[PDB]
Ligand SMILES: Nc1ncnc2c1ncn2[C@@H]1O[C@H](COP(=O)(O)O[C@H]2[C@@H](O)[C@H](n3cnc4c(N)ncnc43)O[C@@H]2CSCC[C@H](N)C(=O)O)[C@@H](O)[C@H]1O
Ligand SMILES: Nc1ncnc2c1ncn2[C@@H]1O[C@H](COP(=O)(O)O[C@H]2[C@@H](O)[C@H](n3cnc4c(N)ncnc43)O[C@@H]2CSCC[C@H](N)C(=O)O)[C@@H](O)[C@H]1O
């Protein structure tokens with residue numbers, strides 16, 4: 001019994017001068033790789049992430065483009081093989097989510113935790 | 123955990139909407155969601171935003187599935203306490219939107235799930 | 246209620262073995278492999294485990310072998326629908342069996358398979 005996280009971030013096409021969904025995915029992947037490595041150096045907690053392309057739909061009156069905004073969804077699980085303290089991991093995820101929000105220049109960002117039963121095959 | 127998230131899975135109906143990419147499929151469903159979400163928001167004052175992911179759904183070829191799977195879209199969203207006073211009314215709104223999305227996409231079936239989640243909202 | 250379980254599996258696509266060259270092509274690769282192992286299991290036990298599959302990249306430390314910006318992966322998910330499932334525990338055992346078959350067939354060294362509580366509303 002453990003936790004997974006899910007983060008939803010915009011890609012900020014204009015600030016990063018990207019022009020394809022795959023460039024935005026490679027952008028966020030590289031940014032996560034850098035900040036997860038830094039946090040691992042500090043705390044020995046490495047937060048790996050599975051990143052998926054997406055579009056997020058909300059009201060055009062509140063800033064959404066027609067048909068939605070390009071986004072990345074990042075998800076990962078606390079693996080007991082690597083994580084001894086679920087609370088420290090969860091605090092680490094929250095720090096990383098805030099740092100991703102800052103580096104991606106996002107005005108808002110969601111970070112969820114969901115209970116999950118992990119079967120790890122090695 | 124302290125709120126709910128939903129997940130809906132829908133086909134993209136290339137036979138009816140005559141689309142031919144992952145982009146035009148996300149654009150189609152996203153534009154449709156944006157319209158039905160706004161319509162429900164006007165009626166109920168509950169706006170349900172959605173995160174839309176490209177996918178394929180794999181099932182038995184003898185039940186209609188193409189080889190390697192049917193093109194689909196996965197829609198997710200979370201009830202944010204800053205926007206949602208009443209989680210049961212939000213749940214009923216999501217279900218109403220799911221049935222409406224099924225109708226607009228001309229889907230024979232459609233799944234809608236609710237999962238408990240703990241939301242941290244940074245603004 | 247509709248109280249049930251969903252599974253989530255994360256698999257690499259093993260470009261060194263299958264040599265796919267795009268995300269759409271590795272999605273079709275994993276989709277075909279799942280289709281065939283789900284079919285075999287359905288013929289034997291009458292439990293068909295469908296899967297939604299999503300393209301993705303998985304980010305971990307390059308020190309441990311991750312490519313820059315992430316490794317190409319596929320996420321597979323599915324949910325036990327009480328209209329088809331007679332025994333949720335047998336469904337769960339079947340998912341685990343299929344996940345291990347997928348691991349073997351994709352020649353993955355490691356693979357995660359999660360179960361998450363969910364409430365399914367099924368419209369037909
Ligand atoms: N459901 C809502 N009800 C009422 N008001 C809303 C709602 N959504 C947005 N608003 C209003 O719109 C304005 C923007 O608010 P945001 O919170 O940034 O609005 C959100 C949500 O609508 C939606 N969204 C984000 N994460 C999720 C998720 N996990 N699931 C589903 N939808 C998601 O996408 C928007 C952010 S879009 C990506 C972030 C953006 N590039 C940035 O720089 O901030 C603000 O004025 C809000 O009051
Ligand atoms: N698991 C099963 N076991 C036994 N019989 C099944 C099963 N699935 C389908 N059938 C048979 O096929 C008939 C059609 O059933 P459907 O429910 O439409 O079968 C489903 C599921 O097999 C699969 N699927 C849908 N949602 C999900 C999800 N969230 N996770 C995993 N898989 C998903 O994909 C199919 C729908 S595919 C997209 C919808 C379709 N374009 C349409 O217009 O209806 C049904 O009446 C049964 O006879």
Ligand SMILES: Nc1ncnc2c1ncn2[C@@H]1O[C@H](COP(=O)(O)O[C@H]2[C@@H](O)[C@H](n3cnc4c(N)ncnc43)O[C@@H]2CSCC[C@H](N)C(=O)O)[C@@H](O)[C@H]1O
Pocket residue numbers: 045046047048049050075076077082255256257258259303304305306309316318352353354355356357
């Ligand atoms: N988080 C970590 N903390 C510490 N050490 C780690 C961590 N991850 C990997 N390592 C080290 O690297 C070695 C390999 O470990 P793996 O378990 O294979 O490392 C994992 C995880 O880091 C990550 N990953 C996989 N599934 C998930 C998921 N659901 N959510 C988030 N991330 C996921 O991706 C890697 C697998 S990449 C795909 C599988 C691979 N092609 C293969 O053939 O095995 C391991 O022995 C450790 O020494």
